[model samples]
Target chain A: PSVFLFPPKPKDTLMISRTPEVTCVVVDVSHEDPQVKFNWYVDGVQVHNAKTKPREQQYNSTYRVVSVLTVLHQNWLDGKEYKCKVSNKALPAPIEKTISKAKGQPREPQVYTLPPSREEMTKNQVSLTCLVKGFYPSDIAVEWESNGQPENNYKTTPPVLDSDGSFFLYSKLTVDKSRWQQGNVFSCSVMHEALHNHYTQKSLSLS
Target chain B: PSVFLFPPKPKDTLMISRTPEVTCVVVDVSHEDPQVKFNWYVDGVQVHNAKTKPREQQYNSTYRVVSVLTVLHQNWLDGKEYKCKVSNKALPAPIEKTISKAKGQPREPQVYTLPPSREEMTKNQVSLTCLVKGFYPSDIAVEWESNGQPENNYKTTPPVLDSDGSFFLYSKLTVDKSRWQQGNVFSCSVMHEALHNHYTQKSLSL
Candidate 1:
């Protein structure tokens, strides 16, 4: 007696890096084995698990898991398996994370400096820079803030991604001097689908 | 017999702070009673009439600029104007920026910190913190790097956005004795859309 592999695992795992060497980790668990339950594990530890974006179970590498990691110089911890455990009554052994961790460890993230002497900056000057180094999916945004508050700071200008694939961002703030002379601080922040921190203020200065 | 009250004249100008602790000028040309044509000007130069965002008259304040100053911010300089100006053909003179020099500039950007760490922890026993002090549109990731380096080891957990306008990214790298003793790095990193230059990266050594 033999069997045929019809419906495959409908899952996608994407690993994105946004730093000197950012690396993303993506795991797709969509095996048709209905009795199978998917439990994610990192370095042998069990994390959460769920179906693909379509919420389908035909199991065909369609559902995707996108994990963005920013690797800086200091944040590299070594040797582990970001694993996933798969089990079901039909399958003899529980399939697990040994396959995913094979690619590589995530790199460290980085730090950047803000523009200089913002107030002294005249209109139309390139005053901001938004850089995404080693992550996958390079589409991102560069926003602005005034007085430690969120304000629209991004301009129509777009960023150019490098050959490696990560996105880079930059914009010049055109302060309404009629407004800047009134005394306030403006900032540049970021927004990402992966990181939880925030539209982090890049730099603050009188504009 | 009298026929006129006054000749065409411009209105008073006002300035607003674009950035905190910074000074800039803005004029309310409508304030003056002069029937003369009034235009908006910066540093004495006339602010060109141009199209902006949000509304044709109001700047995108969030990112795009509106008309009036558009000529200055966009094609001219600073970066782009999030303000607009209207010229009244009936006013006397062009409106000028009623601005003053700033004192000291605002504070530098606060340092971006990684999530804190835990010590003397037991297997499967852990603690966590959602570091969302000053981010925007929070949609970052949370995961465990069970093994760091060349392995890029990680147990994935999808990112979660919070009701507080921030993201609650979650990820668990260890949850048992065999995995716990291995000592992995459970961390979070923010990868912005198109924005990477000022990216803030901090890691939990755990």
Candidate 2:
């Protein structure tokens, strides 16, 4: 088919927050065509000027691009709708995403090992699951650390925005039995906006 | 936010075609994180063996990747569901995109120019739009030329899949008053599946 067209997606849902001073909102649209145009709006006022970083073309004229708009808290004092609209020749229509206001905070992650029971310390496999739910302004990073070292062989799901405005994610990692027999502690670390500078980690070691 | 996550997209939709006595289905998932994994399925059966191309990392730990699956149409004699699934650590959940069967044939594009009436030939600006419609497979290239030379300053809308399984496209070129006064012929050319080795062109002289 000599055709190259893929749907554009926002890197993150629109984010709005305030830290006693300077409340702000931000949004990004990535993996799009180079010629794609992005527009921003703060309560219906179109922002012709915005920050954009166009990634190198990787997929036959399809590019990884990011367009961001930041508005100060003073400007959105009236609870205006901050919107990001993306349009390109390769798209059937313009994509419009509205930023959500900062609301409910993320609960501390509840982490556990899967398969219901510990392995027989043989060549069998085990997995760790981290359940992080009820989060707002969703940006969360879940990582698995082996003996304090980062483990790369793991799977993380995209945050699912719930109907109640909260976000949920389930991240998992397969444990190596060889490492498990060595009494190494595998830690599941979760980083989220609600956690401030620190992260929540759950570590488990074979007795 | 210390977050680096990108969405997963399908590089190519599942396509099935027949020619020379054989029909096949092929699809590709590309431009993803290097750590991403791809899975394929047909009628609920998992396909373990598929070709995968891992792209070099360009954005931090993110790497662009391509994974493709090729299947013979004869094997899928019984109608079944074909699906492509992608997974990555940066993602919160596996992304799934179902495959669509390429069912119909494409018709030759019927081309036309917009702003039917000629401009006053003044210092004002004018835009010429070339509309190409009623094609299939949605793989059409719309190009513009000035005095038979390729013109690059133009915008093309993404191919639109119509209700009847055909495709439509609208490409536009803004004309400079100076070029219009030069009495040059501006042409719109379209290349599509139905055209075979040839292309269709609609030209208008100012």
Candidate 3:
């Protein structure tokens, strides 16, 4: 039997959370047998095991395979080193290469989207959504810029990040029953408190 | 009458997660005499201590100001440092410069917006967005163009950068099925992907 390790060392491999996520791995095993078993370990904990024939996906010569557990989280999956272990009645090179531990990107930041809405646009009801996405460190702030006017009844929650170190910012502005008579321009401006600059720009005009 | 330590250093700096979220610090303390009593830490580890007297925004003050914490996923606020603490009895030595960590733009990439609307033709009822945010990746692909359509999209300007490290992509396209009888074309496309060319263009032909 052979042993394999997860996150398998050489840590810090650059893997983005793009679709068609990463799956399958290449392993080096020691022995081959009928009753032997193939086991996979991530971060040292055994996540999967096979007692009889290796799963069909394991047949690949790469020795790497994928399961429901592997593709779950893109960033979390990067930090684990998967290992395979073979325990047989015979003692012949029972274990193989232990997957090395690889450090992943410190999880990308998260992005928060505004509540889905493209409601009817009326003169009295003006609303603008500032959407911030694809950022890291989550040290950013969002502000509302009216057509050179200050906004009232505006609320800001907090910023969040995705699993890939990217941030998602969402803030909503409601121009209630006071100035709906005037057609004003509204836009969301993203500013990073650290850097101090208005970066992303998305705006809406009222008529 | 106090020697308050900032950010209580956690054990493993290597701790990270898939959902990379910012570290949230709970300032569990009290100040009545109110001259000083602000402390901040990351992952439970105190980074710096500051005097809470001047409650206004300081240029580059102490950790007591707003300690920026960086934590990866799977990190437990459940450890020793995460217990974050504060103290004050004798007071700190009027602290001159409580060193703040260095700042750098690590792997930061930038983005630009597409010049302007080149073509706007929409069909049936669909919302289309043209990504004008330009990127300066080593070798970018041109998969956002389609069907020999030029002048339909603007071609100018570079990507914009948020104070944070993000590329500002800009482009536009929209479709109103109710207006299909009006004869309008709205097209949209992505930058790079395999099975496609440098530019993938789409247009609504009514």
Candidate 4:
């Protein structure tokens, strides 16, 4: 029988929410007794607050077990390590997997909102580019708003690397030329883990 | 009385060595009694392996205490959190500070060795550039060697960020035109934490 840990590692990706918690899943165990055990540990001490799901049989005649260990979001942000251990009679020894939050100092991005170029403004449609640069970890959300209303006509480019080992990306919002001439306020809001409030906004208006 | 921890946090910088230990220092405690207590903890359990230096007198009439906690390098690499707690009569409660190894995935660098440009080769000297890119953590060392002998005439640029959130840098080695004509082997060796052996090398000739 083999044991696999979900989220294989914390550095690959993260599971986050308002009440953020880290989960440990032990999957694909082929055991004859069908009674595999799962243990969860944080740091080096065993924890009893974990919730384990009932083992479910798979189509391949194997069993799957899952356990979730809820942790304080601040503890997760503090880079605490979590361990999942699986014990089974079919295996010689218990399999253990450990994970922690991403390493590195979080850096806030610089947000800039640029109005459409003169050449672009000559056309029926114009674009407002929001440049977000020099942020770490590459996880960000860029949203567009016009006149305080959410706008869906915006497109964001994939993050690019900066010379200082951070990430940058551009989000462009296209609007009708009539709206710009009428002095519509266009706003670009960014959300990233580095921000204290997880938000930064920049607005542009025709001058 | 005030207690401060050395290294403040793991994300700022690191203390590394062959044995690789994390240290905790408690400084600037204004106390009437020179005897202050320091304790070490891992997770929630107390550890006894920590060594504490004798309390020293500060010129400001305050006291200073130092403690060092040696740990297994692999344990530190595994993101084990070490905490230092300081206790003194002048404070209402003990001050605690926690730290662990850096929290990111390690990435190996891509190395490229480029010979001197034809324009530069036409002159009295030539330059070879070594490009190392797409690495994480921004901690690296670039060295140049000629025909198995270390060379000192090389300059390496500071790491720049790549679009994928990694780091890139260049090292240039300038050598006499006579040496290039003779086909001397110029090698660039890179050291980074991501590599299994902490080394990556690229060599150029002619």
- TM-score for each prediction? 0.24, 0.36, 0.23, 0.41
- Fnat per model, in the order shown: 0.00, 0.00, 0.00, 0.00
lDDT of the candidates, in the order given: 0.32, 0.51, 0.36, 0.67
Candidate 2, A1-207: lDDT as tens digits: 012212112222222432212112222323443465667676767667554333333444334445444445434332456666667666677766665444444454323332212322343554444445556555566778877579876666566654445565555455666666668777778765456443667665666
What DockQ does each candidate score versus the true complex, computed on alpha carbons? Answer: 0.01, 0.01, 0.01, 0.01
Q: Is candidate 1 or candidate 3 better by TM-score?
A: 1
The list of candidate 2 runs beyond 4 A from truth reads A1-207, B1-34, B37-51, B58-102, B114-116, B160-167
Task: State each model's TM-score restricted to chain B.
Answer: 0.27, 0.56, 0.23, 0.62
Worst 10 residues of 3 chain B by lDDT: B110-119
> Comparing candidate 2 with candidate 4, which one achieves the higher lDDT?
4
* lDDT for position B141 in model 1: 29
Best by lDDT: 4
Native-referenced Cα lDDT, model 3: 0.36
Error of 3 at B33 (Å): 42
Interface RMSD of each: 15.6, 26.6, 14.4, 15.4
Give the Cα error of residue B8 in candidate 1, in Å.
59
Over A61-114, each residue of candidate 4 has an lDDT whose tens digit, in order, gives: 667776666666566656678788878787789888887755778788877666
Report lDDT (Cα) of residue A91, candidate 2. Answer: 62
